[PDB]
Design an enzyme around this catalytic site. Structure first.
Site, mmCIF file in Angstrom:
data_model
loop_
_atom_site.group_PDB
_atom_site.id
_atom_site.type_symbol
_atom_site.label_atom_id
_atom_site.label_comp_id
_atom_site.label_asym_id
_atom_site.label_seq_id
_atom_site.Cartn_x
_atom_site.Cartn_y
_atom_site.Cartn_z
ATOM 1 N N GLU B 31 0.856 -1.183 0.000
ATOM 2 C CA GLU B 31 0.000 0.000 0.000
ATOM 3 C C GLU B 31 0.892 1.233 0.000
ATOM 4 O OE1 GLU B 31 -4.075 1.187 2.094
ATOM 5 O OE2 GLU B 31 -2.517 0.706 3.563
ATOM 6 N N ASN B 42 7.283 29.638 -9.169
ATOM 7 C CA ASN B 42 6.254 30.714 -9.193
ATOM 8 C C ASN B 42 6.880 32.110 -9.208
ATOM 9 O OD1 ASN B 42 3.493 31.816 -8.932
ATOM 10 N ND2 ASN B 42 4.256 32.502 -6.932
ATOM 11 N N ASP B 44 5.457 36.239 -9.356
ATOM 12 C CA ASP B 44 4.330 37.214 -9.424
ATOM 13 C C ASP B 44 2.970 36.512 -9.475
ATOM 14 O OD1 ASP B 44 6.517 38.959 -9.675
ATOM 15 O OD2 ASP B 44 5.586 40.158 -11.273
ATOM 16 N N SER B 46 0.048 33.296 -7.518
ATOM 17 C CA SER B 46 -0.382 32.396 -6.460
ATOM 18 C C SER B 46 -0.461 30.982 -7.013
ATOM 19 C CB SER B 46 -1.743 32.817 -5.898
ATOM 20 O OG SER B 46 -1.625 33.946 -5.052
ATOM 21 N N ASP B 48 -1.666 27.068 -5.873
ATOM 22 C CA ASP B 48 -2.338 26.187 -4.929
ATOM 23 C C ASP B 48 -2.180 24.763 -5.431
ATOM 24 O OD1 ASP B 48 -3.953 25.188 -2.840
ATOM 25 O OD2 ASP B 48 -5.255 26.952 -2.933
ATOM 26 N N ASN B 55 -13.834 21.160 0.909
ATOM 27 C CA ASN B 55 -14.272 22.423 1.509
ATOM 28 C C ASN B 55 -15.764 22.299 1.800
ATOM 29 O OD1 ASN B 55 -12.091 22.964 -0.725
ATOM 30 N ND2 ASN B 55 -11.766 24.555 0.826
#
Lengths: 125, 125, 125, 125, 125, 125
Positions: B31, B42, B44, B46, B48, B55
């Site tokens: 497993e 990255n 300049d 964002s 994720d 959520n």
């Protein structure tokens, strides 16, 4: 001049930023989930990387229950799991009596990874 | 001039920022989940990165219960787990009586990783 | 001039910022989760790295319970775990009586990692 | 009851992080350059603020001069300055002989900032 | 009851992060260059603010001059300046002889900022 | 009851992050260049603000001059300036002899900013 050259030259795998397995013998049970390879180059923007994306403002909720009887509620159970046997049950009586529900019992394995059987005879004079 | 050269030259794997396994013999249970490789550059902005993104403003909740009887609630159980046997049960009586529900019992393994059987005869005079 | 050269040259694995295992024999139970490789280069921005991301303002809650009877609540149990046998049960009577629910009992292993069996005969005069 | 109220209530300017001048009389020569107001709020990035930005790897250079005669070179002179009269000249003979090139000579000023001329007559009985 | 109220209530300017001048009388010469107002709010990025941006890898250069005669070179002179009279000249003879080239000579100013001429007569009995 | 109210209520300008001038009398010469107002809000990107943007890899250069005579070179002069009179000249003889080239000579100004001439007669009994 006489030359008898023997060379079992062996080299392993070459991995560069990844998930890598070799040559496998006797693999009974295998599980390998969400082994992801990502290369993200970002300039002046937003990147969102997702493999499993859930967005749920109300999820698996139970309502108000004024004065009921013998209700069974199993919400969002056994989620993203493995090897679940006779589990997360909801009852009044659970009786196990047989000689059953057996998992992966009594295997016989005779395996070999690499077999080299060589005979080198030479240079007779 | 007489030369009899034998060389079992062996080298392991080459791994560069990753998950790497070699040549495996006798692998009964395996497993390996969420072994991810990520390269993020990255400028300049964002970034994720997500493999498992949930959520949920309301998740697996139970409502108000004024004066009920014998209610069973198992929310969000056995989540992202492994090897669960006869577990997280909800009842009034649970009876185990048989000779069963056996997992991975009494295996017989005879394995070999690398077998080299060589004969080098040479330079007879 | 007579030369009989024998050299079992052996070198291990090469790992560079990663998770690396070699050539394995007799691997009965294996578990390796969330072994992630990450290379993050950031300039003038925000990076968020996530493998397991949960954001839940209400999660696995129980409501107000005025005057009920015999309620069973098992929320968010057995989460992200392993090897759970006959556990986290909720009842009034739990009776175990059989000769069962046995895990990984009485294995017989005869394994070898590397087997070299060589014969070097040479330079007869 | 008799009330004769006189109040020349006067308050100055209100300045909040800036360049501020009031009500001016008799302003002959005025110069006010590069009086800049900047509010910079920066989070996770680079800010470059510039009013006069020059980037010149070769600027106003003179080449190699083997054996010339009577060369005149005035590079990058009178730069970002004020009130330059008969200056940075390059010649062999400079003769000033007239009754001229006069700057800002013999002004007559009669100025007033605030003139208040009030008559308050009241409460006759 | 008799009330004669006089109030020359006067308040100055209100400036909030800027360049502010009031009510001006007798302004002969005025110069106000590059008085800039900037509000920069930056998150996860690069901001470049420029009013005068020059990028010149070769600018105003003079080449190699082997053995010339009477050459005149005035590169990049009188740049971003003010009030330049009979300056940065290049010659062999410069003769000034007249009664001229006069700047801002012999002004007559009679100015007033605020004139208040009031008569308050009241409350006769 | 008798009330004679006089109030010359006066308030200055209101400036919020800008360039602001009031009511001006007798403004002979005025110059106000590159007074810019900028509001920059940036998220996850690049902003370039420019009023005067020049990018010139070769600009105003002079070539190689082997053995010439009486050459005149005035590159990139009188740039972005003001009030330049009889300047940056290139000659062999410069003669000024007249009663001319006069700038802003002998003005007569009689100015007023605010004139208030009021008569308040009241409350006769």
């Amino acid at each position: 001049r006489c030359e008898l050259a023997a060379a079992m030259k062996r080299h392993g795998l070459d991995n560069y930023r990844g998930y890598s397995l070799g040559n496998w013998v006797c693999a009974a049970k295998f599980e390998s989930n969400f082994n992801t390879q990502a290369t993200n180059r970002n300039t002046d923007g937003s990147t969102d990387y997702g493999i499993l994306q859930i967005n749920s403002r109300w999820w698996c909720n139970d309502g108000r229950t004024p004065g009921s009887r013998n209700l069974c509620n199993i919400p969002c159970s056994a989620l993203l799991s493995s090897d679940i046997t006779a589990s997360v049950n909801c009852a009044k009586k659970i009786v196990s009596d047989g000689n059953g529900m057996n998992a992966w019992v009594a295997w016989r394995n005779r395996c070999k990874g690499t077999d080299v059987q060589a005979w080198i005879r030479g240079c007779r004079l």
